[PDB]
Amino acid sequence: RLPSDLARRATAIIEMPDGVLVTASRYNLPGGKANRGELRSQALIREIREETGLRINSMLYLFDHITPFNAHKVYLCIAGQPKPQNEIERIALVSSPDTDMDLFVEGRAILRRYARLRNEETAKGEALRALLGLARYIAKVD
Amino acid sequence: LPSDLARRATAIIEMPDGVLVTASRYNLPGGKANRGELRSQALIREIREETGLRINSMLYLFDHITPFNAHKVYLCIAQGQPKPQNEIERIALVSSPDTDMDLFVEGRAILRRYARLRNEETAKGEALRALLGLARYIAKVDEGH
Numbered sequence A: 001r002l003p004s005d006l007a008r009r010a011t012a013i014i015e016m017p018d019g020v021l022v023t024a025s026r027y028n029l030p031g032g033k034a035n036r037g038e039l040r041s042q043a044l045i046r047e048i049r050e051e052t053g054l055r056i057n058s059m060l061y062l063f064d065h066i067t068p069f070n071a072h073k074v075y076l077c078i079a080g081q082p083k084p085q086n087e088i089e090r091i092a093l094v095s096s097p098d099t100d101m102d103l104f105v106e107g108r109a110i111l112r113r114y115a116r117l118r119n120e121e122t123a124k125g126e127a128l129r130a131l132l133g134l135a136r137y138i139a140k141v142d
Numbered sequence B: 001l002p003s004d005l006a007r008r009a010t011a012i013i014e015m016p017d018g019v020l021v022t023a024s025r026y027n028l029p030g031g032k033a034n035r036g037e038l039r040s041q042a043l044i045r046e047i048r049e050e051t052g053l054r055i056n057s058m059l060y061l062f063d064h065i066t067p068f069n070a071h072k073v074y075l076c077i078a079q080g081q082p083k084p085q086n087e088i089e090r091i092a093l094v095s096s097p098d099t100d101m102d103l104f105v106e107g108r109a110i111l112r113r114y115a116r117l118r119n120e121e122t123a124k125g126e127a128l129r130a131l132l133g134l135a136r137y138i139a140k141v142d143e144g145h
Helices: A040-052 A105-118 A123-141 B039-051 B105-119 B123-144
Strands: A007-013 A019-024 A031-033 A058-066 A070-078 A090-094 B006-012 B018-023 B030-032 B057-065 B069-077 B090-094
Touching: A007 A040, A007 A058, A007 A105, A019 A040, A019 A105, A031 A040, A040 A058, A040 A070, A040 B039, A058 A105, A058 A123, A070 A105, A070 A123, A105 A123, A123 B123, B006 B039, B006 B057, B006 B105, B018 B039, B018 B105, B030 B039, B039 B057, B039 B069, B057 B105, B057 B123, B069 B105, B069 B123, B105 B123
Parallel strands: A007 A070, B006 B069
Antiparallel strands: A007 A031, A019 A090, A058 A070, A058 B057, B006 B030, B018 B090, B057 B069
């Protein structure tokens, strides 16, 4: 069926040591819809905490990802140790966009776009790489 | 002195000509977190309330405690122009922690530490500088149009 309106969805890319976090109530990137009157960035922090217990302290808006159902904004987030919570029953980690893992199509497509941005010669690509540098240092320090 | 410290979020937002401060003395934007609400959540809500800005990206810099409050301090990007809103009557820009402007004391303390961090050769300093570069690029494209 043709969706008549698009959800204002917020989606999180959370790099753990061995890959990007995905969850399953198919696996998908974590996140959810923003309510009327709230920003997708507000909704993302709320929903990542609900789904995994992670408390986001830093985020970088990366790009929009638009589908017939969803108008995503996609964010690289730094936060703890994830665990399945509430509606989430499993979590895993994805090492590349063509993982064997059974990913929701949109999730794979966003990961593909992420992998490209990571190597971009742009102010945004530099910010993303710097942030991943920070996450890597924090993890190493632990 | 209180039984406990209240959780506050505080934003450092760099506009082209300096860091945003607001007055309802000037202080860095921010406010108290509600029960159940992370400081990073409260930061987005409060900046919007006070300035109309919609934060897309933030970088946690450090904690700043005082006798009453425990602040988390964040460098934030939004791509609009701030404006006095609600209880905020006036806004201005600060170019250095030694500014002449009448800043709240803790507001000044936080800007001094931020000034140090901005120059630091650490992964955090590098992230901070890259985010600043992003904001600058955004502003350059805007001024271009």
